[PDB]
Amino acid sequence: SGFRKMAFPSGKVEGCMVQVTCGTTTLNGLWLDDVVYCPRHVICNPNYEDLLIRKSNHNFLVQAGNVQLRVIGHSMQNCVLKLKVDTANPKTPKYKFVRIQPGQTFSVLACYNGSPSGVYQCAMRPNFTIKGSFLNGSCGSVGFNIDYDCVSFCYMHHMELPTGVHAGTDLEGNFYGPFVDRQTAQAAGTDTTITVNVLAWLYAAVINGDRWFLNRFTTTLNDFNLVAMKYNYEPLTQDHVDILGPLSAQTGIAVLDMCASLKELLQNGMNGRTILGSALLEDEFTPFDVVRQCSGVTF
Amino acid sequence: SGFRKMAFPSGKVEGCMVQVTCGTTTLNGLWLDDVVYCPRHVICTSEDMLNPNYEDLLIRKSNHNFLVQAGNVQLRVIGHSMQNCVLKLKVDTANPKTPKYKFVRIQPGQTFSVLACYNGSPSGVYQCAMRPNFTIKGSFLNGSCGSVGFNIDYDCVSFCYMHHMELPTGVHAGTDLEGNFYGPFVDRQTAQAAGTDTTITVNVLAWLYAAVINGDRWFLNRFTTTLNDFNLVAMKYNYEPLTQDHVDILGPLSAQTGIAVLDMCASLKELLQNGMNGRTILGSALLEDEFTPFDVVRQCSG
Ligand SMILES: CNS(=O)(=O)c1ccc2c(NC(=O)[C@]3(OC)CCOc4ccc(Cl)cc43)cncc2c1
Ligand SMILES: CNS(=O)(=O)c1ccc2c(NC(=O)[C@]3(OC)CCOc4ccc(Cl)cc43)cncc2c1
Ligand SMILES: [Cl-]
Cα distance from N-terminal residue to C-terminal residue, chain B: 12
Ligand 1 pocket check for B301: Cβ under 6 Å: no
Q: Which ligand is nearest to the CA of A161?
A: 1
Ion ligand 3: residues, CB within 5 A, are B 106-107, 110
> How close is the Cα of B106 to the center of ligand 3, in Å?
4
Counting beta carbons within 10 angstroms of the beta carbon of residue B122, is it exposed (0 to 12), middle (13 to 18) or buried (19 or more)? buried
Q: Tell which residue, B101, B287, B296, B104, has the closest CA to residue B201.
A: B287
> For residue B56, how many other CB atoms are within 10 A of its CB?
9
A60-92 exposure pattern, b = at least 16 Cβ within 10 A, e = fewer: bebbbeeeebebeebeeeebbbbbebeeebeeb
Q: CATH 2.40.10.10 region(s) of chain A?
A: 1-14+94-191, 15-93
H or E element, residue A80: strand A80-85
Question: Mutation test of ligand 1: which of A112, A131, A159, A186 has the most ligand atoms closer than 8 Å to its C-beta?
Answer: A159
Q: Tell which residue, A138, A110, A143, has the closest CA to residue A125.
A: A143
Q: Tell which residue, A28, A30, A22, has the closest CA to residue A171.
A: A30
* CATH architecture of the domain with range B15-99: Beta Barrel (2.40)
CA dist A114 → A275, B86, B297 (Å): 39, 37, 21
Q: What are phi and psi of A293, to 5 degrees?
A: -75, -35
Domain A1-14+94-191: CATH superfamily, name plus number:
Trypsin-like serine proteases (2.40.10.10)
> Nominal resolution in Å?
1.9
Domain B1-14+100-197: CATH superfamily, name plus number:
Trypsin-like serine proteases (2.40.10.10)
Confirm whether B80 is a catalytic residue: no
Q: CATH 1.10.1840.10 region(s) of chain B?
A: 198-301
Counting beta carbons within 10 angstroms of the beta carbon of residue B159, is it exposed (0 to 12), middle (13 to 18) or buried (19 or more)? buried
State which approach was used to obtain the coordinates: X-ray
Asked if B291 and B284 touch (Cβ cutoff 8 Å), the reply is no
Which SS3 state, helix, strand or coil, does residue B6 take? Answer: coil
Catalytic entry in A16, A139, A154, A259: A139
Domain B198-301: CATH superfamily, name plus number:
main proteinase (3clpro) structure, domain 3 (1.10.1840.10)
> For residue A181, how many other CB atoms are within 10 A of its CB?
22
Q: CATH 2.40.10.10 region(s) of chain B?
A: 1-14+100-197, 15-99
Alpha-carbon distance of B74 to B208, in angstroms, equals 50
In chain A, where does DSSP find H-type helix? 11-14, 48-53, 195-207, 221-230, 238-243, 245-251, 255-268, 287-293
- Cβ contact, residue pair A133, B299, below 8 Å: yes
List B18's β-bridge partners, or say none.
Answer: B29
Asked if A277 and A215 touch (Cβ cutoff 8 Å), the reply is no
Residue B204 CA from chain centroid, whole number: 17
Q: What type of residue is B136? A: I
Q: What is the CATH number of domain A15-93?
A: 2.40.10.10
Q: What is the CATH number of domain A192-295?
A: 1.10.1840.10
Ligand 1 pocket check for A48: Cβ under 6 Å: no
Q: CATH 1.10.1840.10 region(s) of chain A?
A: 192-295
Asked if A18 and A51 touch (Cβ cutoff 8 Å), the reply is no
Alpha-carbon distance of B154 to A115, in angstroms, equals 10
